[model samples]
Target chain A: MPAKAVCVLRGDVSGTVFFDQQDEKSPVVVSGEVQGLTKGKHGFHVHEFGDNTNGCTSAGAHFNPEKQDHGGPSSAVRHVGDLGNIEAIEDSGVTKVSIQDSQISLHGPNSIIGRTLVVHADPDDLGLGGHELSKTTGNAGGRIACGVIGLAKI
Target chain B: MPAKAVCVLRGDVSGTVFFDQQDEKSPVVVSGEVQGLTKGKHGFHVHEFGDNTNGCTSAGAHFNPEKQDHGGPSSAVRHVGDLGNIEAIEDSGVTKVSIQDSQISLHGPNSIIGRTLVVHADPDDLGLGGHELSKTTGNAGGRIACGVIGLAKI
Candidate 1:
């Protein structure tokens, strides 16, 4: 069967994040709803662990499956998890974003299954923020919310 | 030794939540610091579960040891875990609150050892908001932040 996974972010601000890939070579369809964030851009990235075990703190760092550096999804050199920002819709304050992220996959070395996704407290400064943490965390203030990627029942 | 518990909340907004029973007969001192809230009142209550295992929804309803009606901490009929609205310092957008709560104990009978504390996104209606969900959840927006009560060293 084709591979597809789902994750839910609840409490405080909440929403759903889903990943799907019919073949290992195809890009994973990343989609979801994120609310609670003020109407603005938020740093969104796939994380290393599916569960925080305690809270968003345990999800670990960005899912940099490849040794490549941090960059946006379209960058020539970018972390496998760096899909960049998701903006909240104007009226609803919910970001309903759907995109085909080739950097992510359901299978293979960079498989996103079992990993987690994190919503950051600040807009990703991107690699050009001039600050040092931007080389990695993009200076995102904190992991405001998170979700585990697992096989969806469907 | 008297029983005591504490929980730490991090990411985005951060703080330490602790319970103490220096005197067996005295009320438990429940207090902590919570930052990152917008300048306003927010819902504060002990939740059913110690953590969001499956999700915040899995944390169940507000801790209701008494099976009482939902109301403020001072209400004649209120959930045992209902501590009512806590105001952010406004200037700092942080709530530094400490109170003596009789309904919550450090050990036995009303012990909160395995419970969770949930902070909501909006001001709790205080049971008089004239809304349906307000009667149950205080119409608080979401469980934006949470911490698990556990055995404390001191």
Candidate 2:
């Protein structure tokens, strides 16, 4: 069988996140439901580095295996960490976002196999053609919440 | 010590999701990261019920405990499963989304303690009072992907 793992976020605020490692070629699937967000859209994505150091600020830019410039997933020059934005509605203030990528693998060197998931206070700009500094597209903002992604055995 | 468990998702794609159970009072935090998504936004959330029977569809409606209708997490009468949405982004195609709710717990009774997470093909409407049947604010669309929410140890 294949090797797998799961990681959950726990605290005063709550929700469940799920992940899987199946396709050796393209392994890792993430899914979950969240609550307790400030009503409106927020930034969500995989940072290029890990922040096991300071709260989660050390996670650094979004995961960019291609070394491409910052941009939305739609842009060909986008960074690997450009997940776009997660809209939080009023009332429940919850949103569910999901995605799959071919760049990162679970068993390889480029594997994001073991890293942390960081939630930003704002949305990622996707590094649209703006100022030279804006080239990073989504500037890594304040850390709202975070969790680590791992392998689970089922 | 708190209760922790892990869940894995595998389809044409896959990733690992983990959550930790702190206590039996409030909701449990389920957080994790995904690896394979088409550089963009993907709908995510906790279903009303668990359906590991056939492809995990048995995980019925969103995990709505307060018995509130389906809406955004910010909604007053939102369903337990009313999570807003998540974005995948470019090269990396990875994002993190988390939330908490009293209605759904990782424990017992309404224990999503060991449930699956499903990814949708589209975005959740957030039932912003749009359709006549959209009693809740978020009317999340169809289901495209899924995984189980588990516990973790820390």
Candidate 3:
């Protein structure tokens, strides 16, 4: 059977994040469509813990299992939660992003189950321009939407 | 977010497999209670995949992340899923086993979130005996009980 983790985010944005477990030795396919996002990219990453007790504020920082500097999803040195950005646009209506992430797993030693997902109010600069939080969180600004990742049988 | 996974197995035996996520650089404690054994050591290990659609046979071989030979749990040269064995008695009923492993994790590339758990019918020679599968599966007999690891809230 295939396993999936889903998130129905709410706070500032409205949408869904669906993570589909692929075949053995393959990256998980993360796809979904979110609404109400600004007309561009938003800082997106899986938070360290899955505690929305205080909304997105309690979601903590990025899920960095290896404790590496924050970078783009394609960077050599990046966190497991480094999803780069989720693109949204104006007049274009709903937007969806899909990517094959080998850094994550639905079943493994570094499984991301029960984690917090956060959508920022600003774009994830991808650790460029030498910002302090850039290397830590990409200066993604305040989290507008938050969700707790949960398992969904498929 | 301290992810966790569990497995309730029923076939040749009855038992449960629980996995708790620790900090980075640590093993996901693979602990559980099993019953209906031969009253001795049973080859216990995480299989390559979690496809238990056809009993433990579909679980594939031992989970060797680095293509290593079968060895003890603490051996420097052992498979990532070589968890040694679980000791049981003729009439003692339920038996429990726990060990802190550093070869696995709950939030990185080595995560075992969606794998298979197998309890062998016989003792795992631990590759000490001169057998064919000894160097691969510890010569553990047929997989008595099988279960698929899944995430749970905590």
- Docking quality (DockQ) for each candidate: 0.02, 0.02, 0.04
lDDT by residue (tens digit), candidate 3, B85-143: 88886754888867567776555556554566788988988888797978987888888
lDDT of 1 by residue, A1-154 (tens): 4766666675456787777787878888887778777777788898765444467776677888677667777778778888788887564476786878987886666866546678887788766688888878877768787765554433
lDDT of 2 by residue, B13-84 (tens): 456656556788756665676666656555566764333434545556666666766776576767665556
For residues B1-154, what per-residue lDDT tens digits would candidate 1 score against the true structure? 5655665553345667767787667788877778777788888888764434454555578887677667887777778788887788664466786877878775555656545677787888777777667778888878777755544433
Model 2, backbone clash pairs (residues 3+ apart or across chains), number: 99
> Estimated TM-score per prediction?
0.50, 0.45, 0.53
What ranking emerges by DockQ with the best candidate at the front? Answer: 3, 1, 2
Error of 1 at A66 (Å): 1.7
CAPRI tier of model 2: incorrect
Clashes of each: 2, 99, 17
Question: What are the iRMS values of all candidates?
Answer: 10.0, 10.6, 8.7
Which candidate tops TM-score?
A: 3
| lDDT measured at residue A32 in model 3 versus the true structure, 0 to 100 | 82
Off by over 4 Å in 1: B1-154
TM-score of chain A of 1: 0.91
- lDDT per residue as tens, model 2, A1-154: 4544333442233455565567677645656766776666566666644323344555566677777777766777776556567667764566785755555455554455345456666667767636654567376466677544443334
Q: Name the DockQ score for candidate 3.
A: 0.04
Give fnat for candidates 1, 2 and onward, in order.
Answer: 0.00, 0.00, 0.03
